[PDB]
Design a protein around this ligand. Structure first.
Ligand SMILES: Cc1cccc(CNC(=O)N[C@@H](CC(C)C)C(=O)NO)c1C
Ligand SMILES: [Mg+2]
Ligand SMILES: [Mg+2]
Ligand SMILES: [Mg+2]
Ligand SMILES: [Zn+2]
Length: 890
């Protein structure tokens, strides 16, 4: 279809200086009256004036109070309004339009829409054009004066960006409010909300200027008591940006608003952040533990955009990673500091190495700054976001904390109030880098390849120790696989954070150092290394790469036990698991294909199993860490290492491994499950929505992981423990009782009990839906059909749709049924959903991303469903672009 290219970027021939809106909300229509105070830029060459405007019903068009007429001075085709150049003035002018739109039937949740009884907007990326005409792109920065009117009884709270400057009554039971947002902004940061909303509020005093900021968080009345953690997390985010970056908030007021129907997590509209209710609302008796982490990171992320996205914005959409990667990095820094648990960093690594590495070896592979797009919407990707953040975090690793803060400050100062590009950020970091090296010839020109080159680098190692010289060498190689974006791949600037562990006593042998690999290969030599070390490589996960440590399992075990760095310990464990998984996978696959009547499996390493026991029995070791060591790598991590994957054979492989370990450790697992109870489920802070003990949350996580293992093993009398756990007041515990009960006939009683506990809270019923959807059940397909008919019905709430289907698609055995019925079922949902919400339909395609990694029968089934979906008449441009790229047609 229509393809935009990065190299084709040109500034506009026009400038929009001021936007003055009247948004008049009525029962069956919203009327939008808009004045744009415009001018011609220095780049103008007498061209037609072309506005974006999608699905708008025009009442009137004028320029300087002169009415323009369809077919004579303009054309409109439901996408673009063209004003012929003859009637475009040559100096300052006022463009006026009035259009009609229909929030009430906008089920796509982009533009102006209705979520339950709340009228709300979503404008990023290209939603403003669905409200009114605009040059709808992020370099068209302007100031906004916004009046909203509505029925007073139905819509008493009216909000738009900035200072509320007047409130007034209107005949017929209506009323209005006017806002002035003094900060120049692109139109994707416009927002408006109208509803019967309740709030909590507080005053925050900024650290340096002592500015008073009123903080408001809003929801529908039913869930006002679920707003407190959000408000606290906002106070935390504000203090962190002050403390780490020196950044203060810059309006007198900041509103956060929860709505039930939202396509993603939240949105950074200036002074008016709008959230999926699942990422703003919690209470301890009606939310699982993970809701608290999600709210903290999502509130954080939107707050951090106030500088990284708002005060410094994007020149064009190809720069998305500049705000999202950098904001993800700020959010992860925030989250690591607020949680103070090593699991937080690990969880970011886990997400990258599963979901993002898969994307990066898929036909969807792109660099973090793409070269082209059809729907910009399809480039809000784990690549742009999570690889983006790892790339932004490497600057911190390379520079250190003080020179990182210096380079960041150069960036944010220089480009304040303006657009920026990835080059501008690298330029700023390069200034810091020269200062740190004390050499004005040092440069970061090689660093740009992190923005332009797709694919995951493979970093491999060889070691040599000379005992006479006490000298140790690490020889390092990097390789990125050629792909459709580059047929030849260049070496990157890869920072390798390293230590060296003495295997005799388990201690540190050097001060930690960062090796700067800039070539295809290099050898780093260390002197005064008193015995042969074991290397601790890529500490903290210091670059976004496949690590081939070339260590034995014996050396990996010593790192798991004695290394200081949590990532290296975890990764060493991960590698032991992977070696075992690939070996047994190959054993089962050969036996299956050869139709063998007998064959052998390589047992799980017995010293590894002893090391897992020793960690678990250590009462001073971290409980979150322990939950990571007893869990195999995720399926989407594993698939990155297998071509032609038989999912059945993998499910058999994983079961054998877990069985082998549990045959040794179940008694330890049980004993720990019981000993952890007192501290794990202690009710300190249970009534305090302003404080969360993350260490204690990790103890519950560990208890629940162990309970799953023991349930699946049918450990004696474990059902009793399951029934007791179902009575815990923590929903994390009592929903776990449901999933782990899948292995017993009590499942359907716990299904009904947990349903009853869940059904009167919108968000809790959604967590119940996911718990059911991921239940390890033989009858999962009949359970899905029960969810559809009894609970989902014909809901258009993306949270409901996502809750029912996505966890099921991670069921390795059932979703990949060799019949293809899983693939068919999800395809039908995608196509159904695409007729009203193209964005959500494409999110539901995620399970197909690995199609060309599967065995050839499963490839064929997925491929047939994808081509079928592509044959759907009126398929959205979103879904079509996605499926065309995914099936190697584009
Ligand atoms: C396809 C799609 C669907 C919904 C929303 C958008 C605009 N994106 C947006 O607000 N992105 C979030 C990311 C989400 C996972 C929450 C963001 O970074 N907000 O700051 C897009 C582009
Ligand atoms: Mg319309
Ligand atoms: Mg996150
Ligand atoms: Mg609902
Ligand atoms: Zn963001």
């Amino acid at each position: 279809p229509k393809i935009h290219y990065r190299k084709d970027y040109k500034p506009s021939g026009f400038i929009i200086n001021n936007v003055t809106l009247n948004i008049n909300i009525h029962d069956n229509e919203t009327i939008v009256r808009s004045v744009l105070d415009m001018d011609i830029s220095k780049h103008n060459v007498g061209e037609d004036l072309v506005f974006d405007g999608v699905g708008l019903k025009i009442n009137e068009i004028s320029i300087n109070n002169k009415k323009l007429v369809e077919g004579e001075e303009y054309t409109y085709d439901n996408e673009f309004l063209t004003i012929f150049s003859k009637f475009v003035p040559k100096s300052k002018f006022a463009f006026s339009s009035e259009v009609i739109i229909h929030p009430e039937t906008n089920y796509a949740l982009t533009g102006l829409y209705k979520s339950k009884n709340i009228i709300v907007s979503q404008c990023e990326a290209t939603g403003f054009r669905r409200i009114t005409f605009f040059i709808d792109r992020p370099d068209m920065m302007a100031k906004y004066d916004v009046t909203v009117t509505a029925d007073k009884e139905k819509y008493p709270v009216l909000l738009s960006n900035g200072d509320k400057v007047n409130e007034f009554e209107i005949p017929g039971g209506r009323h209005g409010a006017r806002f002035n947002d003094p900060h120049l902004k692109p139109c994707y940061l416009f927002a408006v909300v109208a509803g019967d909303l309740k709030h909590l509020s507080a005053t925050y005093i900024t650290k340096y200027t002592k500015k008073k900021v009123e903080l408001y968080v809003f929801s529908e009345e039913k869930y006002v008591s679920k707003l407190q953690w959000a408000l606290e997390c906002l106070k935390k985010s504000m203090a962190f940006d002050e403390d780490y970056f020196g950044l203060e908030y810059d309006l007198s007021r900041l509103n956060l608003v929860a709505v039930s129907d939202f396509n993603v997590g939240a949105m950074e509209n200036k002074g008016l952040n709008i959230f999926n209710a699942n990422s703003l609302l919690a209470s301890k008796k009606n939310s699982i533990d993970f809701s608290y982490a999600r709210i903290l990171t999502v509130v954080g992320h939107e707050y951090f955009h106030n500088y990284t996205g708002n005060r410094v914005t994007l020149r064009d959409w190809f720069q998305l990673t500049l705000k999202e990667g950098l904001t993800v990095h700020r959010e992860n820094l925030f989250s690591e500091e607020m949680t103070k648990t090593v699991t937080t960093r690990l969880s970011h690594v886990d997400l990258l190495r599963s979901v993002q590495f898969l994307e990066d070896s898929s036909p969807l592979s792109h660099p973090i700054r793409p070269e082209s797009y059809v729907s910009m919407e399809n480039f809000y990707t784990t690549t742009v976001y999570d690889k983006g953040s790892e790339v932004m975090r490497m600057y911190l690793t390379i520079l250190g904390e003080e020179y990182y803060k210096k380079g960041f400050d150069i960036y944010i100062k220089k480009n304040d109030g303006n657009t920026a590009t990835c080059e501008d950020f690298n330029y700023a970091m390069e200034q810091a880098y020269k200062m740190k090296k004390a050499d004005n010839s040092a440069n970061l020109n090689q660093y740009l390849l992190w923005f332009s080159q797709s694919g995951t680098p493979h970093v491999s190692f060889k070691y040599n120790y000379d005992a006479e010289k006490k000298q140790y060498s690490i020889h390092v190689n990097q390789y990125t696989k050629p792909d459709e974006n580059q047929k030849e791949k260049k070496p990157l600037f890869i920072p390798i954070s390293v230590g060296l562990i003495n295997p005799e006593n388990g201690k540190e042998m050097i001060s930690q150092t960062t090796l700067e690999l800039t070539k295809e290969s290099d050898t780093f030599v260390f002197n005064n290394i008193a015995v042969k070390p074991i290397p601790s490589l890529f500490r903290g996960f210091s670059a976004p790469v496949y690590i081939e440590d070339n260590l034995t399992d014996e050396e990996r075990i010593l790192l798991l036990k004695y290394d200081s760095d949590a990532f290296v310990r975890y990764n060493s464990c991960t590698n032991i698991y992977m070696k075992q998984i690939l070996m047994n996978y190959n054993e089962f696959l050969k036996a299956k294909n050869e139709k063998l009547e007998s064959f052998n499996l390589t047992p799980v390493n017995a010293q590894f199993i002893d090391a897992i026991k020793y960690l678990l029995e250590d009462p001073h070791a971290d409980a979150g860490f322990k939950s990571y060591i007893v869990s195999l790598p995720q399926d989407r991590y594993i698939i990155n290492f297998v071509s032609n994957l038989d999912t059945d054979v993998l499910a058999d492989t994983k079961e054998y491994i877990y069985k082998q370990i549990g045959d040794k450790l179940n008694d330890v697992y049980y004993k720990m499950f019981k000993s952890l109870e007192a501290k794990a489920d202690d009710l300190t802070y249970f009534n305090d929505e302003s404080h969360v003990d993350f260490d204690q949350m990790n103890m519950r996580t560990l208890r629940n992981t162990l309970l799953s293992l023991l349930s699946k093993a049918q450990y004696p009398n474990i059902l009793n423990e399951i029934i007791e756990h179902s009575k815990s007041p923590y929903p994390s515990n009592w929903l776990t009782s449901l999933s782990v009960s899948a292995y017993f006939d009590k499942y359907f009683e716990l299904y009904d009990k947990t349903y009853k506990l869940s059904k009167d809270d919108e968000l809790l019923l959604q967590e119940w839906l996911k718990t059911v959807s991921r239940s390890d059940r033989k009858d999962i397909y009949e359970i899905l059909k029960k969810l559809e008919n009894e609970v989902l019905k014909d809901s258009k709430n993306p949270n409901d749709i996502r809750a029912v289907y996505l966890p099921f698609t991670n069921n390795l055995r059932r979703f990949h049924d060799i019949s293809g019925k899983g693939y068919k079922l999800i395809a039908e949902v995608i196509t159904k959903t695409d007729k009203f919400n193209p964005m959500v339909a494409t999110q539901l395609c995620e399970p197909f991303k690995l199609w060309n990694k599967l065995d050839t029968k499963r490839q064929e089934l997925m491929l047939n469903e994808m081509n079928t979906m592509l044959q759907e008449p009126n398929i959205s441009n979103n879904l079509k672009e996605y499926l065309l790229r995914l099936t190697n047609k584009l």
